[PDB]
Amino acid sequence: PNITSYTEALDEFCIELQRIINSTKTLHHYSHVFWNRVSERIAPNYYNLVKRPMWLQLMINKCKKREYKSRKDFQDDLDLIVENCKIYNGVNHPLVSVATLIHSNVVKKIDEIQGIEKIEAYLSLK
Numbered sequence: 001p002n003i004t005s006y007t008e009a010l011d012e013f014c015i016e017l018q019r020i021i022n023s024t025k026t027l028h029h030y031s032h033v034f035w036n037r038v039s040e041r042i043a044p045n046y047y048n049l050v051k052r053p054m055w056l057q058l059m060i061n062k063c064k065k066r067e068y069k070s071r072k073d074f075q076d077d078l079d080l081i082v083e084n085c086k087i088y089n090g091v092n093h094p095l096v097s098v099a100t101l102i103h104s105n106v107v108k109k110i111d112e113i114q115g116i117e118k119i120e121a122y123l124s125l126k
């Protein structure tokens, strides 16, 4: 991959982020809980507490629209998954350790993206 422009860098970034999010499906037997939007039928009150909900399919959709312009934009959304999980369920709820495992696994995989330094360099040439 010859990344030589901002646009080429952003296209590659968002394909790589998609792959990393998709890899979380095999991470843990409760990973799937974070994939789709929380339904009111199952979580009464959820949207009374949680004003910025986040789930992994939504992050995939944002990658496909090239809405992540940096690592920080991406990690801001990933932070919400953990924050909402902790606050709604309680920090000792079993789902919390799953959300933090997803978070740390994802963050580590971003650093392993082949050519991540080159991608982030061209992303800084907005």
Ligand SMILES: CC[C@@H]1C(=O)N(C)c2cnc(Nc3ccc(C(=O)NC4CCN(C)CC4)cc3OC)nc2N1C1CCCC1
Residues within 6 Å of the ligand: 033, 034, 038, 042, 043, 046, 084, 085, 088, 089, 095
């Ligand atoms: C929203 C809080 C927390 C969370 O943080 N997320 C992200 C979440 C994402 N998805 C789910 N999904 C489901 C949740 C409940 C059920 C279900 O069928 N519950 C029964 C309903 C009838 N009742 C008599 C007995 C229990 C099915 C789900 O299908 C995938 N739950 C989540 N929960 C918790 C995990 C169980 C409760 C809520």
